[PDB]
Amino acid sequence: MGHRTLASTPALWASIPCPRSELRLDLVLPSGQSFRWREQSPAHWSGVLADQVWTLTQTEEQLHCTVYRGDKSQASRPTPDELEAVRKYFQLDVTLAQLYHHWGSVDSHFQEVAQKFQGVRLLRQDPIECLFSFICSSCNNIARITGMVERLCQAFGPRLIQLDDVTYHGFPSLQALAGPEVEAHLRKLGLGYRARYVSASARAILEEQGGLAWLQQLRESSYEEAHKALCILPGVGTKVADCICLMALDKPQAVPVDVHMWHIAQRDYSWHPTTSQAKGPSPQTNKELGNFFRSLWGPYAGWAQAVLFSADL
DNA sequence: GGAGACCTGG
DNA sequence: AGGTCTAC
Ligand SMILES: [Ca+2]
Ligand SMILES: [Ca+2]
Ligand SMILES: [Ca+2]
Ligand SMILES: [Ca+2]
Ligand SMILES: [Ca+2]
Ligand SMILES: [Ca+2]
Ligand SMILES: [Ca+2]
Ligand SMILES: [Ca+2]
Ligand SMILES: [Ca+2]
Numbered sequence: 001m002g003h004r005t006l007a008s009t010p011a012l013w014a015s016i017p018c019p020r021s022e023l024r025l026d027l028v029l030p031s032g033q034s035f036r037w038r039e040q041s042p043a044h045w046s047g048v049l050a051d052q053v054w055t056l057t058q059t060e061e062q063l064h065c066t067v068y069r070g071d072k073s074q075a076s077r078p079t080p081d082e083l084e085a086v087r088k089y090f091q092l093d094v095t096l097a098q099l100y101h102h103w104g105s106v107d108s109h110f111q112e113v114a115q116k117f118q119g120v121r122l123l124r125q126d127p128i129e130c131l132f133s134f135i136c137s138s139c140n141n142i143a144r145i146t147g148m149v150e151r152l153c154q155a156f157g158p159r160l161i162q163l164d165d166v167t168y169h170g171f172p173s174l175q176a177l178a179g180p181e182v183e184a185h186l187r188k189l190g191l192g193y194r195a196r197y198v199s200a201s202a203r204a205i206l207e208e209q210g211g212l213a214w215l216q217q218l219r220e221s222s223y224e225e226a227h228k229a230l231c232i233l234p235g236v237g238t239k240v241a242d243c244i245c246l247m248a249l250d251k252p253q254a255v256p257v258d259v260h261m262w263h264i265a266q267r268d269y270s271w272h273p274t275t276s277q278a279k280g281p282s283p284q285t286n287k288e289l290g291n292f293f294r295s296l297w298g299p300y301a302g303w304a305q306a307v308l309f310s311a312d313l
Numbered sequence: 314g315g316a317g318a319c320c321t322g323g
Numbered sequence: 324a325g326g327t328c329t330a331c
Pocket of ligand 8: 324
C-alpha cells in the first residue's frame with residue numbers, strides 16, 4: 001500500500017495531544033537538526049524513530065502518528081508505549097509557550113520575531129547519528145549533508161523496510177563505521193576529506209575511549225566536561241561539539257557560534273567583542289559570543305537560537 | 314599563539 | 324556551504 005496518509009488508512013493512526021504552538025513539523029524536521037526526514041506526502045513526514053519507521057502529520061490540536069511494522073507483524077495503530085518514544089524524541093515535556101515567555105520578557109527583539117515562528121523546539125537525537133552527521137557538516141550545506149548522510153546510511157546501515165521506492169535504513173553502528181576500507185568506500189560517496197574523520201572517530205571511540213558507553217555517558221556529565229571530551233575526537237571542533245551537546249547530550253545551554261550568529265549579534269543586538277582585540281570571528285571571540293547569549297537568554301539559550309535561526313531564513 | 318591544506322558541487 | 328587540523 002506504500003506510504004500512508006491520514007485519509008488513506010484512518011484505522012492505523014494514533015493521536016498525541018499537541019497544539020501547533022508547541023510543535024511545527026515543517027519547521028524542525030528539515031531545519032538542519034536531523035537529516036533523515038522526508039515530506040513524502042504533503043504535510044506527511046517519514047523517518048526512522050526508535051529503530052522503526054514512522055509517518056507523522058499534525059492537525060490544529062493533535063499530532064497523528066503511525067508506525068510501520070511490515071509483514072513481520074499485523075497492521076495496527078501505535079501502542080501507548082510506542083507513542084512514548086515519539087514524545088521523548090520531541091521532548092514534549094519541555095513547554096515552548098513557557099520558554100517563549102521567558103525569552104520575550106528579557107529580550108525585546110525576541111518578541112517581535114518569535115510571534116510568527118512558534119513551534120520551534122529541539123529534537124533529542126541519538127549520540128551516534130548526531131556525532132557523525134555533524135562531522136560531515138564541515139564546509140557543507142543542508143542539502144549536501146542530507147545527501148551524504150543518506151548515502152552513508154544506505155551503504156552501512158541495516159535495512160528496515162521498503163515503502164514505495166524507498167528503502168529505510170537505520171543508522172550504522174560503531175563497528176560498521178570502524179571496519180576496514182570504510183574511508184575509501186565513503187570517498188566514492190562524495191564525502192571528501194570528511195571520510196577520514198568518520199573512520200578515525202569511529203575507531204578512536206571503540207579502540208581508545210571505552211566504546212559506545214563512553215559517548216552515551218556524556219549525557220550525565222556537565223556541558224564543560226562533555227564539550228572538552230568531544231573535542232578529543234578527530235574532526236570534532238568547538239562548533240561540532242556544541243551541536244552534539246545541544247542536540248544529543250541534553251545541554252540546552254550550548255550555543256554553537258558561527259558567522260550566522262555573528263550577523264545576528266551585530267545587527268539585532270549591536271554586539272561587539274570586549275575581551276579580545278580581534279574584531280572578527282576567532283576562538284577567543286567565539287567563546288565570548290556564546291557566553292553573551294547564555295547570559296542574555298539563560299540556561300536554554302540553545303533553544304532560543306533555534307527560534308532566531310528559523311526566523312532569519 | 315593567534316594561515317594555509319583538505320574534498321566537491323558548482 | 325550548520326569547519327577542523329597542522330604549522331609557525
Ligand atoms: Ca490521551
Ligand atoms: Ca539503536
Ligand atoms: Ca535510508
Ligand atoms: Ca564551552
Ligand atoms: Ca578534535
Ligand atoms: Ca576546544
Ligand atoms: Ca533592535
Ligand atoms: Ca560561506
Ligand atoms: Ca547556521
